Write a protein that binds this ligand. Structure first.
Ligand SMILES: [Cl-]
Ligand SMILES: [Cl-]
Ligand SMILES: [Cl-]
Ligand SMILES: [Cl-]
Ligand SMILES: [Zn+2]
Ligand SMILES: [Zn+2]
Length: 408
């Protein structure tokens, strides 16, 4: 509600001849140091800046006195917070897993439009220089529109020529909504559709509804809260070392292992789905993710445990709990939500969370078995962080996998 560059309150505001205002830090960071141009409208402010920097009159005293009453990453987080503060109508967006520069977004077909009742998924990629460079926004759901083509590119002025740091991803999503309601056939991306819209509006409305029906019939994101698997880590420990406990500090490290493995597998599985233009993540993407990221025998065993859980899940009775159907301690239904919540794909198949849950359980068991062994070497009955560090370092494959995870 004040500074357009950093979306924070204005401090020592500087107003340029063009009357765009930014806080003194932002002004110094982007104008004074190099560009000497307004970041919003690119008006040259060199003569003005040199004069007033020498005379210490840059700051707008009147505005400043009466107000009392990296940068790219920081701002993206401010957008997401802003997005939660004022959820845009008919829209949602959030990061893909833990990648803040790669978001998923959903748009519900406006009531006014012929897309009503459909859900359209979009991909958003933030550049390194954001907010000074535009975000890359594209549809992954087919849609019949003059300004949207089969590649999912969107011809919208604010996405390219008219992009400004003052704009936000919420405003961008609202503008796309308006574009769905009111196309611009005069400057089209697809001429045939634009010609049809101009001459046969009834046909345009008809084809839009049929496409919406055929192809169109994505959230706050993974969130800031750290998930815990204490319940299921404990169950596995009782199976692997019934007479060995685990300290709560060690349990927090186990959560860090599980969450790290979850994010990496799903993230890669997300990469594969997008790479092959697949709407749904299935056990296949999870398996190829596992095979590429896990080393050696860990990968061979993880693939075995995942294939066996999926096989047992399909043949089992549909009445029992999903985790029970797969013979797993780790929660299948919960892993499924975390795959949808993380915005890795439009859809998530039912075998995917089973396979991933089984891979997580297997790796947890491996780590717990070795940590317990490492505890029994020091004549101890309870796993502490040090025994987790030992179990990782003393196993070449596990150290390749989890060595980068910090252990205190
Ligand atoms: Cl100038
Ligand atoms: Cl594009
Ligand atoms: Cl599946
Ligand atoms: Cl990796
Ligand atoms: Zn600022
Ligand atoms: Zn300006």
């Amino acid at each position: 509600c004040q500074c357009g560059i950093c979306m924070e309150i204005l401090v020592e505001p500087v107003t340029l001849p063009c009357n765009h205002t930014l806080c003194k830090p932002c002004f110094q960071s982007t104008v004074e140091k190099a560009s000497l141009c307004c970041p919003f409208c690119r008006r040259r402010v060199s003569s003005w800046t040199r004069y007033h920097t020498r005379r210490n009159s840059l700051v707008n005293v009147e505005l400043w006195t009466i107000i009392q009453k990296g940068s790219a990453l920081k701002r993206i987080n401010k957008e997401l917070s802003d997005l939660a503060r004022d959820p845009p109508a008919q829209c949602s967006a959030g990061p893909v897993g833990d990648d803040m520069f790669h978001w998923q977004a959903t748009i519900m077909g406006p009531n006014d439009s012929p897309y009503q009742g459909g859900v359209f998924f979009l991909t958003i990629h933030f550049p390194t220089d954001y907010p000074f460079k535009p975000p890359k926004v594209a549809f992954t759901t087919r849609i019949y529109h003059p300004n949207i083509n089969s590649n999912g590119s969107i011809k919208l002025d604010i996405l390219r020529s008219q992009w400004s740091p003052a704009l936000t991803i919420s405003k961008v999503l609202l503008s796309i909504c308006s574009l769905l309601c009111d196309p611009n056939p005069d400057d089209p991306l697809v001429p045939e559709i634009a010609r049809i819209y101009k001459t046969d509006r009834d046909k345009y409305n008809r084809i839009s509804r049929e496409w919406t029906q055929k192809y169109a019939m994505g959230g706050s994101g993974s969130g800031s809260r750290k998930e815990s698997y204490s319940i299921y880590v404990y169950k596995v420990l009782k199976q692997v070392h019934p007479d060995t406990g685990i300290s709560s500090k060690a349990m927090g490290i186990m959560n860090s292992f599980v969450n790290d493995i979850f994010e990496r597998i799903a993230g890669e599985a997300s990469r594969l789905a997008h790479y092959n233009k697949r709407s749904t993540i299935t056990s296949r993407e999870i398996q190829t993710a596992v095979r590429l990221l896990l080393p050696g025998e860990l990968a061979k065993h993880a693939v075995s445990e995942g294939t066996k859980a999926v096989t047992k899940y399909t043949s089992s009775a549909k009445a029992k709990t999903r985790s029970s159907r797969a013979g797993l301690q780790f929660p299948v239904g919960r892993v499924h939500r975390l795959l949808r919540k993380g915005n890795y794909s439009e859809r998530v198949g039912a075998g995917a969370p089973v396979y991933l849950a089984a891979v997580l359980e297997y790796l947890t068991a491996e780590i717990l078995e070795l940590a317990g062994n490492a505890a029994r070497d020091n004549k101890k009955t309870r796993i502490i962080p040090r025994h987790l560090q030992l179990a990782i370092r003393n196993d070449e494959e596990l150290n390749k996998l989890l060595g980068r995870v910090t252990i205190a």
